[PDB]
Amino acid sequence: ATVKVTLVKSLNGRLANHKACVKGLGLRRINHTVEVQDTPENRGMINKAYYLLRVEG
Amino acid sequence: MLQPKRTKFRKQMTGHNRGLAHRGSKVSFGEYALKATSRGRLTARQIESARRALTRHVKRGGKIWIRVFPDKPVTKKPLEVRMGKGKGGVEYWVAQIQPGKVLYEIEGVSEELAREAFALAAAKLPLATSFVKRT
Amino acid sequence: TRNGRDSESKRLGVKLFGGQAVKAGNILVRLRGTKFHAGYGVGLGKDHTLFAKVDGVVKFETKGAFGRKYVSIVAA
Amino acid sequence: FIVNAQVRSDLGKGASRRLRRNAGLVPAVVYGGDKEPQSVTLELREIAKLLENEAAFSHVIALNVGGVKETVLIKALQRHPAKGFVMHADFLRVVADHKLTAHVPLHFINEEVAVGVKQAGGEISHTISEVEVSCLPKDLPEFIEVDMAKVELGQIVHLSDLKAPKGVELVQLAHGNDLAVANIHASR
RNA sequence: ACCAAACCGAUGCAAACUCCGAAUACCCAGAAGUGAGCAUGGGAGACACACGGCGGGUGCUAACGUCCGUCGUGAAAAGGGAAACAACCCAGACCGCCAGCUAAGGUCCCAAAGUUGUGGUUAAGUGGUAAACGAUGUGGGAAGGCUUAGACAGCUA
RNA sequence: UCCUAAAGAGUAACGGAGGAGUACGAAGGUGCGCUCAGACCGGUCGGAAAUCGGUCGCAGAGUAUAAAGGCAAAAGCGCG
RNA sequence: CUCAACGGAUAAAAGGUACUCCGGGGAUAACAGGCUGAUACCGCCCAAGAGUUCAUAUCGACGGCGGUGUUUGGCACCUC
RNA sequence: UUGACGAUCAUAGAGCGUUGGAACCACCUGAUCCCUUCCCGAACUCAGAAGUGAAACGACGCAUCGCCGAUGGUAGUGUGGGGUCUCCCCAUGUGAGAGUAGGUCAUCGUCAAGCU
Numbered sequence: 001a002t003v004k005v006t007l008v009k010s011l012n013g014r015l016a017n018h019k020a021c022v023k024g025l026g027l028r029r030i031n032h033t034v035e036v037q038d039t040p041e042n043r044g045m046i047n048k049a050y051y052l053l054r055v056e057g
Numbered sequence: 058m059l060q061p062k063r064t065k066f067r068k069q070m071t072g073h074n075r076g077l078a079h080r081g082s083k084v085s086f087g088e089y090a091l092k093a094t095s096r097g098r099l100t101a102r103q104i105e106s107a108r109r110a111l112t113r114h115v116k117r118g119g120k121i122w123i124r125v126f127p128d129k130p131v132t133k134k135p136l137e138v139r140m141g142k143g144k145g146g147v148e149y150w151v152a153q154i155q156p157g158k159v160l161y162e163i164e165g166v167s168e169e170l171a172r173e174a175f176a177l178a179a180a181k182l183p184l185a186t187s188f189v190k191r192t
Numbered sequence: 193t194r195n196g197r198d199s200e201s202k203r204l205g206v207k208l209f210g211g212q213a214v215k216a217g218n219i220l221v222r223l224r225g226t227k228f229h230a231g232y233g234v235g236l237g238k239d240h241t242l243f244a245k246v247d248g249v250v251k252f253e254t255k256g257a258f259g260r261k262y263v264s265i266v267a268a
Numbered sequence: 269f270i271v272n273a274q275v276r277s278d279l280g281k282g283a284s285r286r287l288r289r290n291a292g293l294v295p296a297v298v299y300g301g302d303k304e305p306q307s308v309t310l311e312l313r314e315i316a317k318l319l320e321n322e323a324a325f326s327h328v329i330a331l332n333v334g335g336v337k338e339t340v341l342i343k344a345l346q347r348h349p350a351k352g353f354v355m356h357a358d359f360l361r362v363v364a365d366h367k368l369t370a371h372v373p374l375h376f377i378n379e380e381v382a383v384g385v386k387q388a389g390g391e392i393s394h395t396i397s398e399v400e401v402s403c404l405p406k407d408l409p410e411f412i413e414v415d416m417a418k419v420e421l422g423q424i425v426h427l428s429d430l431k432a433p434k435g436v437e438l439v440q441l442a443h444g445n446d447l448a449v450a451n452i453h454a455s456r
Numbered sequence: 457a458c459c460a461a462a463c464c465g466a467u468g469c470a471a472a473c474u475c476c477g478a479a480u481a482c483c484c485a486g487a488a489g490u491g492a493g494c495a496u497g498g499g500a501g502a503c504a505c506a507c508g509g510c511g512g513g514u515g516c517u518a519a520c521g522u523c524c525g526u527c528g529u530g531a532a533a534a535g536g537g538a539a540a541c542a543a544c545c546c547a548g549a550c551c552g553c554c555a556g557c558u559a560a561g562g563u564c565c566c567a568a569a570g571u572u573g574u575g576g577u578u579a580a581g582u583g584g585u586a587a588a589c590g591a592u593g594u595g596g597g598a599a600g601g602c603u604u605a606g607a608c609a610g611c612u613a
Numbered sequence: 614u615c616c617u618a619a620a621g622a623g624u625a626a627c628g629g630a631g632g633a634g635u636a637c638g639a640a641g642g643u644g645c646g647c648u649c650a651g652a653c654c655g656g657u658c659g660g661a662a663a664u665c666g667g668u669c670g671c672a673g674a675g676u677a678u679a680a681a682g683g684c685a686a687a688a689g690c691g692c693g
Numbered sequence: 694c695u696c697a698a699c700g701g702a703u704a705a706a707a708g709g710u711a712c713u714c715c716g717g718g719g720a721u722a723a724c725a726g727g728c729u730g731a732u733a734c735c736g737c738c739c740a741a742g743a744g745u746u747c748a749u750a751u752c753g754a755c756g757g758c759g760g761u762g763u764u765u766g767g768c769a770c771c772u773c
Numbered sequence: 774u775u776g777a778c779g780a781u782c783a784u785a786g787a788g789c790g791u792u793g794g795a796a797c798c799a800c801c802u803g804a805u806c807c808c809u810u811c812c813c814g815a816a817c818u819c820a821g822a823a824g825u826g827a828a829a830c831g832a833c834g835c836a837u838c839g840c841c842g843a844u845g846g847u848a849g850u851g852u853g854g855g856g857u858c859u860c861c862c863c864a865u866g867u868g869a870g871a872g873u874a875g876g877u878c879a880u881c882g883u884c885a886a887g888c889u
Contacts, residue, residue: 009559010547013528018852026490030547030559034490041488047866051853068629070471070617071517075860076848080871082349085467086395094350096860106756113741118391118455128469133516136732137766140515140522142627153469157349165391180739181756183588189352191397195630199614205622209483225683240683257782258685282865284846297845299874305844313598344873346846356846358873396466440465442837447465 002035005046006054021045022052058101059127060150068144069130074098078157086122087162088191091175093154095185101127101150107161107178114174115166122162127152154184210252214244214265221263231264269324272332276309294354298331298340300361308333315354323410326372326401328362343370362405372401376450377413384421384452392416393451402437409436416450425449
């Protein structure tokens with residue numbers, strides 16, 4: 001199935017690598033919630049940027 | 058004092074003083090020892106102040122071992138000299154201590170004679186040392 | 193008494209790693225005297241520069257007595 | 269000599285350090301001849317009584333893992349170098365027939381009156397201790413008595429001189445060597 | 457009574473010492489999803505850098521010292537926090553509103569919001585600057601040592 | 614050429630250490646052969662150490678020239 | 694071909710100025726400030742000893758931990 | 774029963790001990806004749822067995838040296854945050870080296886040739 005994510009930190013003082021992990025998921029700004037198809041590659045990007053995110057189910 | 062006879066090089070980097078001491082922390086020869094519980098570096102004149110303190114509070118017998126040996130030369134530019142013309146000359150020699158390392162060992166004495174003898178040698182060293190036994 | 197004077201850093205290395213595809217003149221390893229020996233389909237030029245002769249995939253295998261490093265190119 | 273243990277189904281660096289500050293436990297393993305190695309938690313308040321004991325290193329200890337009972341001999345102690353306290357224990361199952369290897373304390377029992385000490389101005393310098401053993405687990409050597417009361421100012425004592433009782437070998441004579449044990453010499 | 461190779465055993469240490477040996481970073485291949493590579497032309501500006509974090513040289517492991525490697529912020533970024541405080545935390549301003557929920561930081565009075573609930577601790581105004589070192593300050597946790605056969609103190613020879 | 618240099622390349626300092634401004638007509642090609650230093654014991658005037666014989670070796674030698682990386686198809690040694 | 698000042702200004706090049714002059718600079722020095730304390734100056738810890746005996750009435754070798762910014766410095770942030 | 778050519782490079786090595794002939798193999802006899810020695814039939818080569826398994830070589834045994842080597846713990850380290858901040862700690866991913874229990878007197882392939 002799917003899983004919804006929530007961007008809860010900013011993107012501005014971050015690395016060049018975590019700032020592309022979040023853009024690869026499709027998050028644009030804070031409190032923007034998308035649906036990803038939960039594959040081994042989408043939830044690989046979540047493990048890098050776990051602290052910017054809120055995986056609420 | 059204590060220093061090498063001939064050295065393959067003349068000067069050396071600074072480096073760092075990291076980690077604990079896993080080898081060097083076990084008493085091997087004596088039955089009592091003075092191990093060091095704070096990191097620092099000893100400058101090879103402190104060793105002869107601490108050695109000549111233990112050897113006159115015994116007066117009778119005992120055997121003394123000195124576990125640590127300074128081999129690291131340390132430089133110092135002379136006064137009234139601007140910076141950046143080379144590297145200064147070697148003034149003295151340094152050993153590098155890290156917590157757990159055993160400094161002195163003693164055997165053939167009483168424990169309460171020796172406990173109040175390492176009190177004298179600890180007041181000459183810039184480290185916080187402790188008293189340990191042989192197991 | 194005074195000592196600056198370094199040299200200018202020849203750019204040695206190992207190109208063309210474990211699964212690459214090659215041609216016939218590729219170089220695969222500069223070298224400094226036989227870290228890697230001439231395997232199956234490679235050249236070993238003048239100053240011990242390896243090079244390819246046929247086409248395929250690099251291997252980097254350890255073989256034989258003396259345990260020497262053989263760079264061979266496999267037609268795969 | 270008795271301890272009692274638990275199972276410890278949490279392995280790592282993180283879970284192993286939380287044992288020591290939260291609960292006060294000490295990790296351990298039990299590995300032996302017949303079975304698999306099994307990990308174990310013990311307390312730091314208990315092992316403290318056994319490590320304070322004298323001959324407890326070269327002696328058999330009964331371990332209560334669950335209600336599981338096993339005769340266990342201890343051959344390792346990893347110990348914290350800075351402060352000084354016990355870290356994981358690493359001991360051994362005891363089979364009724366597989367040889368064994370441990371270390372044994374010495375005592376130097378009679379050195380009050382030695383001919384090197386009373387006649388000439390004497391000193392006795394114990395070089396070695398903790399000599400090993402190679403025995404059969406049925407009959408244990410707790411210690412070995414050495415007597416340097418006897419002959420000389422100016423003789424060293426080898427490993428060949430002192431005797432291992434009831435048919436126990438010494439590994440250092442099994443290798444081609446014979447270490448010196450104790451000296452008698454003049455003081456400075 | 458000299459010393460002292462060499463050899464056996466225990467024992468330490470190297471940027472210019474290695475029987476070994478990671479994490480990361482690099483390359484090339486595979487795919488899913490989300491959102492801008494190469495080549496040829498026109499026009500430039502720059503080539504005095506600053507601090508901070510993590511690895512280092514030099515220095516006295518001194519300087520908001522100085523030369524490098526890498527990420528971030530100033531430069532070229534306002535707003536809120538640190539009493540005032542480019543570069544440290546938070547967050548990136550298209551414009552209007554006498555609308556609502558939040559981040560770091562906070563809730564006695566200057567000063568917007570708890571004189572909130574619970575369990576202990578410190579009496580020094582510690583909080584609200586600091587070193588070897590010293591001491592019947594106190595709270596907790598395992599220890600032992602001796603003791604109604606009379607211990608320790610005390611007054612009794 | 615090594616170190617600083619952070620296990621790809623690269624990378625500074627009036628930062629630590631050293632070397633070149635050439636030799637060779639065989640010191641090149643090729644075929645054929647062959648192994649070091651040292652240890653030790655025996656041996657005429659050497660004698661701690663020359664040549665010879667022997668056992669042990671297991672690259673600790675050698676490489677035209679600095680150091681680094683190498684070398685049993687020996688890249689080391691000899692002859693046509 | 695050695696400006697070997699090794700990407701090499703010309704075939705062919707030394708010095709003075711307190712008699713000096715123009716254009717610039719706190720990108721850069723001497724005075725005072727500023728950060729820093731190696732050096733200083735004031736202390737304090739162990740106590741070998743001498744002080745006839747007696748380490749602390751007075752001193753205290755061998756060595757360690759600080760404070761003040763007072764002078765010899767380090768750096769070059771302000772002002773040419 | 775052996776002999777050749779490989780595969781794999783020590784868990785395959787070294788040491789000790791045992792053991793094999795008339796098929797193989799090795800030593801062996803003589804150099805006249807090929808051919809060889811900076812001297813030498815030593816090595817190289819040729820005509821050849823008798824003789825022998827001594828040496829050598831293969832097999833069969835021993836873990837005495839060597840060599841491999843767990844599990845657990847520990848060092849270090851990527852990202853996020855801490856603190857008393859020349860050094861460490863917390864959450865999370867990763868995880869040696871050394872040592873311990875123990876292992877190892879190899880395993881195969883192609884032909885000629887010995888039950889075969």
